[PDB]
Design a protein around this ligand. Structure first.
Ligand code: GTP
Ligand code: MG
Lengths: 846, 90, 154
């Protein structure tokens, strides 16, 4: 096959994959537009001689979509496989995943962190820590990966702010201290202290090809002057340490009052002087500076403009990017060493099983275990390619494989299929290298298994490997709340759209497509630009037809506030057995403790009940007697047995509990108000008259009966609705902040925090907004503030809608924004009208 | 002439009639419109931020720079109208 | 511009639509595929550029690199080894470019020309014939100033 010219032979990359110690699986991430794809462009320019940046435009070598070019933002996470040298000269194999930094594509990072071991967080030196950086530190700690931080855009400390040197050092120290604080907030490990002395923090500027740690610039000193232990010299270039020119030593006390720090004196001021002599003094004193530093240029190279000449001078000076390689090797484990917490975290069935011990060593032969998370489309869009990593064994082209889905269990054996591998590639950004075998520890692109794959898949052997279980599904960082409804324009072309509706369900990890009972096709999303990309990809790549889209709405939920006035009893239609229930709301903060896995089922009753009676001061009787949580084992509800073994024989009650939990878990989804999920409610079992004969204890009698019991207990205890609230961070100049306060005044919001950015003339506004009011919010700010203020919004929480959703005395005029007491009634009636229920529900319905 | 019915931006929005134009750190200027008139029509907010955050010697530095600018303006004007000038200097 | 009648369905039911805030045309233009029926020949606009934080210099007697107090003040407060393990550099070891000063007279002007419009950010190019240089294009390209009459806006 044909390939571009590369500084290393491809047979070297083919032979280097067989050693699992010389590989690093690294995910680059960060906030929106802090220099990820440009750093990847610099790495591609380092590895390829024939690929160079244009003089006026950014390259974006790993931005291959047309939407990514027209919008100017990253959309899909893209892999690349390169070979890079370190400082000492040893070649290493890197699998680098570029994830998009926008918040609504945070699901593209979670699919990237499932198949990697280390995180490289890019932070803008001018803006500092922002919203998505704070979210990705949490999402990288909770997924148990090692974290390194690279500070990009330091030239903005030079050419834009024009900042004094020790103040820029103070800015960098404040950024690193904020990183250490956000690490120490979430991590339980006290050995995660980030400092540039440990080789853990690297400094960079992506636009002019600058990348250095302390060790690489000490290596530059050792290559310039000679006879210097650079690894010892790099241990004293950060912190309050001073060079004393009398004794030629590094002392912590001040030699003079005007003595600069060592990082300012040796590292930062030569960078200032290089940029100053290139930018300001190109005509008079630039040849003396370039003759002192040892860099020679052509006369045709000296006639360029200021920016390509500065990029060329910094590229000839700093050279290859060895400090990034040193950091990603020192602080990110190999896939042989770091396999054990990956198997402990992601493999269902535990690491203590037989297959977990086999996958814990990264054995390149034996049981073939692969885990595919990403699905890529072709140029034609008629078929997909799977993309994952090889946990164990060696995958081969033409080998029959067994695809296992997310619904597979050893008991069922339903979600499984036998397929044939067509081709195998290793992925570079704009081309793919075809191979015939991939060993363990690498990333792999598989052709011919795309048909049973929906979100993720597990590849095993057909014969043998009988105790293979699937890996965990992707636990996303947010919950999609935006509902949109779609229809085709021509109703005869409905099976065409239903093709594309199951194709964009494969390439998008957090997308949720469903069909309502009224026949409406509902797509769930997290924001406006996300569903914009959904519609673009859907139409232009999978439909080629016109599709009508409705007005977007948010997803509502159901709750209670008060305790029900009367005991709710109901019998089965066999008229032998009766269930009675009182419904109450939960305490403040327990819902989130269930959602964040602080409280869990399957514990052996001790520690579980002990948590309830220790923290929330629950009665010991209740604390021992919890049967179930929410619609999921992790959902924010509780079911409490409040029978007594003296009042009803609990030995007979313990046989019907298995049907009552099915009743509860099928009755807590699609509640009686507008067929939605309940939040924040506990259900408490009073009188139960249990049938004696086994044929009267059937589930078909009692599960809709317990469903009706839950519904009656919910309707009696003053039911209310809940809406999602977004967290909003606004980056604005010093006068537009009052305009932001003016704009947020009409969308039922409130501003919580207004904080000045240290080291920058911008402010940050942190506020909450209703998600139903957040349609067109960004356009309102960027139009009213002349495009200066910018804002991003993520899902934060749920709160109760004001108003009564059961007040039939309230009349609703159509086509009018209603005030605050009319809100819950309007929302409830319009959602019932949309989903296709009756125009009202009564108190005595169930 | 162009008719008034061809006009756009006739929108009854509180956000769009008062579009809240920028002044750009009290340093940027709209081109062509008179610079003294632009310094008169400013919000007069960033001047307070200056006189709060400048150094105590920098108020004297700002006053000395304004005195040098007024000296340059007095050297420039020394282009009056003939109703306030004499005969030997005309 | 000149242009380049729908029945009541189950889909456009206004009893299903929550009218909370009025949807405008710039919402359709910024996001062309979310709120539009039949979006035929739209073009995808640019999303966002990072905020250029370049601050202009008003006094030539100030140094070129100076803490201009529009910038907010930084609030003030590691494995440091001991002084006893004495590391000593050779005598000819110096920091880079210590003979050159930090800033010259052409430094601030060189930084200010980096953010100049076209062609003032250049230093080399070709000539253009004099009738191909519009001098008014930015003025009606930017926006309308406030307080202008009707016919000037038209
Ligand atoms: N001043 C300066 N600008 C930079 C630097 N690196 C990148 N930029 C610019 O910032 C803008 C965004 O860079 P990208 O690399 O596209 O940002 P990004 O991180 O890929 O954004 P995502 O798509 O979220 O990944 C471009 O105009 C870059 O040229 C840098 O070192 N200095
Ligand atoms: Mg990017």
């Amino acid at each position: 096959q044909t390939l571009p010219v590369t500084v290393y032979e491809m047979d070297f990359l083919a032979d280097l994959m067989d050693n699992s110690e010389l590989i690093r699986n690294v995910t680059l991430c960060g906030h929106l537009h802090h220099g990820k794809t440009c750093f990847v462009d610099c790495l591609i320019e380092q590895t390829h001689p024939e690929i160079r940046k244009r003089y006026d435009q950014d390259l974006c070598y790993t931005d291959i979509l047309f939407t990514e070019q027209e919008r100017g933002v990253g959309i899909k996470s893209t892999p690349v496989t390169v070979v890079l040298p370190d400082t000492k000269g040893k070649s290493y194999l890197f699998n680098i995943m570029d994830t998009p930094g926008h918040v609504n594509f945070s699901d593209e990072v979670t699919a990237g962190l499932r198949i990697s071991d280390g995180v490289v967080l890019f932070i803008d030196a001018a803006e500092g820590v922002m919203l998505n950086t704070e979210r990705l530190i949490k999402h990288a700690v909770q997924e148990r990966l090692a974290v390194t931080v690279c500070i990009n855009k330091i030239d903005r400390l030079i050419l834009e702010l024009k900042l004094p040197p020790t103040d820029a050092y103070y800015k960098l120290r404040h950024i690193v201290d904020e990183v250490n604080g956000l690490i120490s907030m979430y991590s339980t490990d006290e050995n995660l202290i980030l400092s540039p002395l440990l080789g853990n923090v690297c400094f960079s500027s992506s636009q002019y090809s600058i990348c250095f740690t302390l060790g690489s610039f000490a290596k530059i000193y050792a290559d310039t002057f000679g006879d210097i232990n650079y690894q010892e010299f790099a241990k004293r270039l950060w912190g309050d340490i001073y060079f004393n020119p009398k004794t030629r030593k590094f002392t912590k006390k001040a030699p003079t009052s005007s003595s600069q720090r060592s990082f300012v004196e040796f590292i930062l001021e030569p960078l200032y002087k290089i940029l100053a002599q290139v930018v300001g003094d190109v005509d008079t004193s630039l040849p003396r500076t370039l003759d002192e530093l040892g860099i020679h240029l052509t006369k045709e190279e000296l006639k360029l403009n200021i920016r390509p000449l500065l990029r060329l001078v910094c590229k000839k000076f700093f050279g290859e990017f060895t400090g990034f390689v040193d950091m990603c090797v020192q602080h990110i484990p190999s896939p042989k060493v770091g396999a054990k917490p990956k198997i402990e975290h992601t493999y269902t069935g535990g690491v203590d099983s037989d297959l977990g011990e086999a996958m814990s060593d990264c054995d390149p032969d034996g049981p073939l275990m692969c885990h595919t998370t990403k699905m890529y489309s072709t140029d034609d869009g008629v078929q997909f390619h799977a993309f994952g990593r090889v946990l164990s064994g060696t995958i081969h082209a033409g080998q029959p494989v067994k695809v296992l889905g997310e619904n597979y269990t050893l008991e069922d054996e339903e979600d499984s299929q036998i397929c044939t591998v067509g081709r195998l590639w290793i992925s570079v950004a704009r081309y793919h290298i075809e191979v015939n075998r991939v060993p363990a520890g690498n990333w792999v692109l598989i052709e011919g298994v795309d048909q049973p794959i929906v979100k993720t898949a597990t590849i095993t052997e057909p014969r043998g490997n009988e105790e293979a279980q699937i890996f965990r599904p992707l636990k996303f960082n947010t919950t999609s709340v935006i509902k949109i409804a779609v229809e085709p324009v021509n109703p005869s072309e409905l099976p065409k759209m239903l093709d594309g509706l199951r194709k964009v369900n494969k390439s998008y990890p957090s997308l949720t497509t469903k069909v309502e009972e009224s026949g409406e096709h509902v797509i769930l999303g997290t924001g406006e630009l996300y569903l914009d990309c959904v519609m673009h990809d859907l139409r232009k790549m999978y439909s080629e037809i016109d599709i009508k889209v409705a007005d977007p709405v948010v997803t509502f939920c159901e709750t209670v506030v008060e305790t029900s006035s009367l005991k709710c009893f109901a019998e089965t239609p066999n008229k032998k057995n009766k269930i009675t229930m009182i419904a109450e709301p939960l305490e403040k903060g327990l819902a989130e403790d269930i959602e964040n896995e602080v409280v869990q089922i399957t514990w052996n009753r001790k520690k579980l009940g002990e948590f309830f009676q220790t923290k929330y001061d629950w009665d010991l009787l209740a604390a021992r007697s919890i049967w179930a949580f929410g619609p999921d084992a992790t959902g924010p509800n509780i079911l409490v047995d409040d029978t007594l073994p003296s009042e009803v024989d609990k030995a007979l009650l313990g046989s019907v509990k298995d049907s009552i939990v099915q009743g509860f878990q099928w009755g807590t989804r699609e509640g009686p108000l507008c067929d939605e999920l309940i939040r924040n409610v506990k259900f408490k079992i009073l009188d139960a008259v249990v049938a004696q004969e086994p044929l009267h204890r059937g589930g078909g009698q009692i599960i809709p009966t317990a469903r009706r019991v839950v519904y009656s207990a919910f309707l009696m205890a003053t039911p209310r609705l809940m809406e999602p609230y977004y967290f909003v961070e606004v980056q604005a100049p010093a006068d537009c902040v009052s305009a932001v306060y003016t704009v947020l005044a009409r969308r039922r919001g409130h501003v919580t925090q207004d904080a000045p950015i240290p080291g920058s003339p911008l402010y940050t506004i942190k506020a909450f907004i209703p998600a139903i009011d957040s349609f067109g919010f960004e356009t309102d700010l960027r139009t009213h503030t002349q495009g200066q203020a910018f804002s991003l919004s993520v899902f934060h929480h749920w709160q109760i809608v004001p108003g009564d959703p059961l007040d039939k005395s309230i009349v609703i005029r159509p086509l009018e924004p209603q005030p605050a007491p009319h809100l819950a009634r309007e929302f409830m009636i319009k959602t019932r009208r949309r989903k296709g229920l009756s125009e009202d529900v009564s108190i005595s319905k169930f | 002439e162009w008719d008034a019915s061809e006009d756009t931006s006739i929108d009854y929005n509180p956000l769009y009639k008062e579009r809240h134009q920028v002044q750009l750190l009290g340093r940027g200027f709209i081109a062509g419109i008179d610079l003294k008139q632009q310094k008169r029509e400013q919000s007069r907010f960033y001047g307070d931020l200056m006189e709060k955050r400048r150094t105590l010697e920098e108020k004297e530095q700002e006053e000395a720079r304004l005195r040098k600018l007024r000296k340059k303006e007095a050297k420039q004007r020394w282009d009056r109208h003939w109703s306030q000038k004499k005969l030997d200097e005309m | 511009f000149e242009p380049l009648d729908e029945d009541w369905n189950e889909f456009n039911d206004i009893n299903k639509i929550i009218i909370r805030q009025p949807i405008r045309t710039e919402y359709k233009i910024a996001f062309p595929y979310l709120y539009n029926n039949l979006p035929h020949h739209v073009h995808l606009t640019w999303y966002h550029t990072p905020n250029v934080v370049f601050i202009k210099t008003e006094d030539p007697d100030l140094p070129a690199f100076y803490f201009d107090p529009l910038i907010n003040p930084i609030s003030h407060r590691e494995p440091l080894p001991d002084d006893d393990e004495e590391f000593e550099l050779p005598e000819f070891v110096e920091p880079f470019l210590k003979d050159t000063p930090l800033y010259t007279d052409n430094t601030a002007n060189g930084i200010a020309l980096l953010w100049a419009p076209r062609p003032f950010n250049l230093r080399s190019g070709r000539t253009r014939r004099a009738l191909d240089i519009p001098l008014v294009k930015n003025w009606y390209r930017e926006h309308c100033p406030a307080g202008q009459p009707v016919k000037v806006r038209v």
